[PDB]
Symmetry: D2
Subunit: 454 residues, 4 copies
């Protein structure tokens, strides 16, 4: 139903990225314009001029970490529509019904679909917006624009994207921009660059290209102790059955993720209001107090599964140093030799406490998480539009960043999505509040036009 | 939206009973007439003349067995709309959203709502049809009618109902009837009539009236080993903390209900087709082979809970004969003395194998299940409209009973709901297929009118 | 401590088979002779002359079905000593302590060790009796003996065993014999002999020899729906990742094993008394009523795991006929073509109801359970010592078979172990009562000598 | 077997307290002297002169917190003997066997006995040492003694105890002392003294005496968010069915206890060596990093149970302020009015963040945990025997406190048990290492005598 806008026309909304965050906005807009769900939508005149720019060739949801068997870490009810409107055609349950699979999923008695299934649910959602999404487009910069060039008022933005295949630059003009680009791979600064040192985000993509023979006796190390590291470490024994694997962590042990009901309530959509209204001190204190819900934590079932495997090695061999798969707690990497004639790097280890063994490995999987600062690069040319002296983007409750009112028209603005954890809570980078947030976003961006019909 | 029909007018549909079975038909009709869900509904002219007759004063779902804590025995996905259309406003999830309770239910991580909650979900559904439901109306008979009295063709039915409060008889004429009246309480024929002998269906209703003091030291017996007996036996220790309870069963032990996924697939809506198409031999054989999914079975968690309580008695006292709460396996009642001057009846027991103890009790809770033959009484006057010599109602796949084509107009008919287990499967008397069956029913009854618009 | 008896000497006890049943007798005897556990053992004079004959080269516990990951189906508390005496050095917990593994097993929070671990526990037990066990000895016949050849009284037995490696026959004389030889592989009589048709008992042993390349695209069928079939079917997708597998069952679905607490109590050691004392009618009726505890049943977790895998195939492909791993319910094999030039047999299928597809397979795994009648062949020459006209062995409560008192001395006898399900219950062929039964056996066999010391 | 020593004689060991810690020492000594378990014990000459002093009238294990239904928070394998020797007659499993209850406990499939059952297991253990335990004896002071009064060398200690019933002081002389007195109730310093303000440790003891009518409509508050608070809060709705309850916590939510396998390994007996050998910095850092295993945490099942109850209140009433049972997160008590004429105290609340409601309550249950500094009072007169200038007791690895070698004979010493968390780990105050620690203690105290026999 959402028809495309020609590249040359001034858009109402331009969204950078087409992952879950932007997809949920697209769904919310569809629903707000659906007369079947929003009775006032029968009176809307023109369709808003909207466009989504995605750098991937097609919709994919963390494809490099689509480890076989890997499950969702959130209830399917927290899909892209249900918490806002269970009547929506974009719910996970309606998707299953459409695929002829609803009765079968029911028989599984689980709230946790496979990652592979949930990606397909979101792929199914994404495809219905193909006319308004430009794939293979990496946005490189956002530039302020003045429709009256002689004035001192900014009232639009130019979004410039590089074609991933051809390398050419395109420009699209919009009144309002949304940055929903997720996070970048975080690597420890001490580790050197080498094709054998690969971030977890590229596990399914890059590793099989490097270690082509699945039956060879490789030595493979994993750095980290989060969900990503545990998943890779568990997968390696299956993917490379004859390989010797090592898990290197600086903590003493893998620790369970906390989804206990009372604690879990921080992820409730209505709690964003309460969290935002807290002071910087209480917000920082609150984030630290509830960290075990999301960061440096592993799902209990996975910890137990790994532990069980470790015990089975003990049954077969009482000598820990002879085990095929090992875990080295409270260790840090101090040096990596990678200029030797052999295919194996040499990793020097020490205690993580305030010296130890050396490992020879064919590959080092680095599962050290993500940073969320990629938007900063894209927004460098619009920095001067912030209030004088303010050197950081300040998102409001509605995610619209603060800009000097005397420099920027009220019709122009920039919204940030999925990088606002410090201001909005631990549900910000997740799927938790996407259905509800998407609806709030549509009301914040298209509210004026939707009021005319209401 | 469904407007009432005056009592004097010829109805298109008259439904006897307004429990889940009829409620799901009402919901399906609403949805078939909703242009938002069925695009062809924009062209329908007149609303069908429909009426539901319910004997209870208001909607209640097995209120006599609303034991505190009692849970659902089926996934909430198998509600009254979802398996047919997850977009419907009558889904369990939309209900929760409407009550402002969806995020909270999500945090429970359960597919099994409390019975109390699910009744309220269905109460919420039922209330939106209050204009087309006549409460306090017990249907007593269905009578064949001929619009041309001199002809030999029946083309309508008179439905006669007794007002529960006033005792007066009313009559409503309809082309099509649905009998969806559930089941009647089954009592062992050997047990005599006494106010102290109460069926499980009346546990919350009748027992507190008989045993008014909750702190008194009563002796209370429970007969049976199904879900009802286990629930009552478990509840009694809480409801009457100082009472001595006994569970009398003829089996050796309580046995778990089977909801293992492969086995559970017999409850799939599309399987009704496959089950109906089987022969009488294969259907009888199939029902017997899968009995542990529904009959004489208890949910595992409840069995374990009871067992745990029994063990705690063993910790406190190694003498089984001194226990406050006891279970007597493989026993049958042979005689009940109930003419003695005391308040306690005397129950004589024997082995159930092809003699034993005597119990003195203030009340005997009889949890011996249900029969489904109440429709037979209401349909006695229409029996002669069946094909010559046929002494049982033969429901088709679409639940319409066979009638002689030369005696009954094609516009007239009678449908049976919830009593067709032998022909339609073990999902027939349950909630399992209600959403889908309701939709099939609407197509079978109102199909002609809905085709004109489609 | 148990010293060996020379082959030529008259033994007090000769045991045929050294599996769990006989191992538990050996342990019980050790414990009865241990002054630390039985205070009267300080006064015993001579060690009884005992010998165990085992056909396997060394102790192994169903080695052909040691599928990777396969777990125990019984609590570790029901090991070979604990239920009789938790102080015994032969308990599972003491074994773990001896291996330096007790604290680690504790951290697993499971009552269900790996099959591989529990076999090693029993191997550990078995090794301490190596001096009184003759491995590589297959017993072929038991012969009545008369120390006075001119009399008509039997007072000993000759046990004849064939050396598995050399083929020679040895003879050992004993007053008392125990037959504890477990069960033989049951094959459907309709299936023809072929190296590609293999019983489940030989899965780990025989299949890898036939299908040597684990990466080849084989077609592999599994017949059955018990624990063995489910385990093999689940394992095949891992063992042969590129092979197309089929599960052929005559039932409609895999059904869960019943270990619900009240029901499980039939396995209690003290219940053997109660079960034995029942009539043939009640025993047959009782066995049939509780069949789901042991036969044609699969552990719930495994059913769910398989079901989950099947659903994952549905996610990837909605076409069931294209799935790599398939299950064909309610089917029976009617013909097997196996004289064709290709490596694949052709299996003709029909409905199991009172016609279907053809499968081409490289191997057929037959998981159709076991028979327990091997003792009959070994006892043919002693049949005439039973009471006149009695054509079946009648074991007493103490497992000693009935023999004519005028033909057999009171000092001579034959005991049956693990084949007495019809007389002793569903715990007879299991590990359930082994600790307690072993102790009863020692008292039944060595009671006279142990009374002198007591 | 352990015979009593007359009060006047010099003891080898005097133990202050007869709870789990001391009980495990008694058991270890029994086992070390049992020739059946320790082969060298056949050669020991004299029984050591040992005595245990307990202030309670008889053995009781946290009797004031024996809330109905309350379960163990540790595997039964970590009983008072098993991890040291599974052959011991003092194991939990042997206890069950002795009570005729082993097969039944097995059928529960749980590692977590009821608190009531486990106390009875330890009561059963304790009774076999009744001849060497003096009940009703509260130790008040430990005094250094010099057998040569003119010398400057201490070589014994006088232990002085007050009879709880009569008030008289008794004195017992010993070479070696063990202080195993557990912890004292910790109350917030801001709360005033009042009979209506009761510590959790006295919940079952003191509250029913204050609130005698269980059916009255009381207002009852609970302060805290640990296991104790959750247990009391959950129990109150059952114990006082018509009472309005409030949970006051300064944290945002109840948080789950961590027993994930890898993390749980800190509780392994052999890990005490590794923990003790760490520096003060690493030990403090380690304790803080693993706090969620023991402190301010609730068992997941209990959190969920409470949460479920809270949701059921939401079903019945959407207004949180009308709920019978409520939880007030992030609150602190600032003032308590308790001089008013009514029976209800007035509690003034504020936010716990760096103002709120007032509660009127009949009782305030204070579940604010325990302190472990009671030994300091008893050891004041022996303080000067520590090395010059050292103002804190420094326990060695073997739990023997450091004393000046020139002041104290090598035959004299004082050991601390259950208060050494800072030096020995999080397993110190628990049941976790009691079996193993008890054995280490016996070797540390009676080692010289046991070497003569070995
Ligand atoms: C392996 C993994 C599994 C997870 N699973 C869960 C889960 O089970 N439940 C849960 O609640 N949370 C989960 N998360 C958290 C995760 O952040 C969210 O599920 C989700 O990815 C957030 O969506 P987003 O759109 O904000 O970011 P993303 O999903 O990363 O979407 C960003 C998109 O923008 C595109 N993009 C980036 N830069 C540019 C550019 N310059 N120009 C154009 N396009 C660009 C990217 O290609 C990407 O498609 C998971 C995270 C990971 C890494
Ligand atoms: C205690 C209990 C709990 C259950 N819980 C579950 C569950 O968890 N999940 C599940 O799938 N199945 C469950 N069932 C099965 C149950 O049959 C269905 O949930 C459901 O009740 C079937 O609906 P129905 O309309 O066919 O029958 P009913 O629900 O019995 O509805 C029949 C209605 O017709 C009315 N009526 C009867 N006779 C007349 C008359 N002569 N005139 C007018 N009105 C009349 C009655 O008042 C009643 O309201 C349960 C059954 C019981 C007894
Ligand atoms: C794969 C599998 C797994 C099982 N797991 C469980 C479980 O988890 N828990 C449970 O309670 N039950 C289980 N069982 C049931 C099983 O019957 C018992 O665990 C156990 O094997 C019974 O011991 P047994 O000594 O009676 O028979 P077996 O264990 O079969 O021992 C018989 C021994 O006698 C030897 N023998 C046979 N014939 C001769 C001869 N002519 N001469 C000399 N020696 C001979 C055999 O080599 C064998 O070693 C399992 C069964 C199978 C097939
Ligand atoms: C309610 C509760 C439940 C618990 N449950 C668990 C559990 O499930 N698992 C677990 O591992 N840990 C648990 N714990 C931890 C607990 O500390 C240990 O289980 C155990 O109590 C430690 O034993 P102890 O002998 O060191 O201390 P205690 O058990 O407190 O024993 C001290 C004894 O010394 C006596 N005493 C004190 N002062 C004197 C004196 N001056 N003179 C004479 N006698 C004195 C006391 O009467 C008492 O009997 C629990 C703690 C509490 C409060
Ligand atoms: N199929 C099975 N699960 N067999 C094992 C049965 C063991 C039995 N439930 C017991 O506790 O002793």
């Amino acid at each position: 139903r959402l028809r495309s806008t020609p590249q040359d026309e001034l858009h109402d909304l331009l969204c950078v990225g087409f992952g879950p965050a932007s997809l949920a906005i697209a769904i919310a807009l569809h629903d707000a314009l659906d007369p079947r769900l929003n009775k006032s939508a029968s009176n809307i005149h023109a369709q808003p001029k909207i466009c989504f720019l995605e750098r991937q060739k097609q919709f994919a949801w963390h494809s490099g970490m689509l480890v076989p068997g890997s499950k969702m870490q959130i209830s399917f009810i927290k899909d892209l529509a249900t918490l806002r409107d269970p009547r929506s055609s974009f719910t996970f349950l309606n998707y299953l019904h459409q695929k002829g699979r609803l009765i079968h999923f029911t028989n599984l008695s689980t709230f946790l679909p496979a990652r592979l299934e949930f990606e397909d649910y979101m792929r199914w959602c994404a495809q219905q917006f193909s006319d308004v999404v430009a794939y293979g487009e990496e946005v490189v910069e956002v530039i302020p624009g003045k429709s009256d060039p002689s004035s001192s008022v900014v009232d639009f933005f130019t979004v410039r994207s590089r074609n991933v295949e051809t390398g050419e630059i395109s420009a699209r003009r919009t009144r309002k921009v949304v940055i929903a680009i997720g996070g970048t791979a975080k690597m420890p600064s001490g580790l050197p660059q080498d094709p054998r040192i690969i971030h977890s985000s590229k596990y399914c993509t890059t590793l099989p290209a490097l270690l082509k023979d699945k039956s060879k006796p490789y030595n493979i190390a994993v750095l980290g102790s989060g969900q990503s590291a545990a998943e890779i470490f568990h997968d390696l024994q299956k993917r490379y059955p004859n390989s010797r694997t090592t898990l290197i962590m600086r903590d003493s042990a893998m620790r369970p993720s906390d989804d206990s009901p009372f604690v879990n309530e921080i992820f409730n959509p209505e709690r964003v209001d309460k969290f935002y209204s807290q002071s910087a001190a209480e917000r920082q204190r609150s984030l630290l107090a509830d960290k075990a819900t999301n960061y440096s934590v592993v799902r209990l079932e996975l910890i137990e599964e790994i532990y069980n495997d470790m015990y089975l090695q003990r049954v077969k061999n009482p000598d820990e140093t002879q085990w095929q798969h090992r875990i080295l707690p409270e260790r840090k990497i101090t040096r990596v030799e990678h200029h030797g004639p052999q295919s194996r790097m040499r990793i020097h280890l020490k205690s993580s406490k305030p010296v130890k063994e050396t490992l020879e490995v064919d590959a080092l999987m680095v599962a050290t998480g993500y940073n969320r600062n990629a938007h900063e690069r894209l927004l460098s040319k619009v920095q001067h539009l912030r209030p004088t002296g303010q050197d950081q983007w300040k998102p409001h409750r509605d995610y619209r960043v603060e800009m000097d009112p005397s420099k920027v028209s009220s019709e122009a603005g920039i919204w940030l999505q999925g990088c606002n954890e410090r201001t909005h809570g631990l549900s910000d980078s997740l799927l938790s509040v996407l259905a509800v947030r998407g609806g709030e976003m549509v009301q914040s961006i298209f509210g004026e036009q939707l009021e005319r019909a209401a």
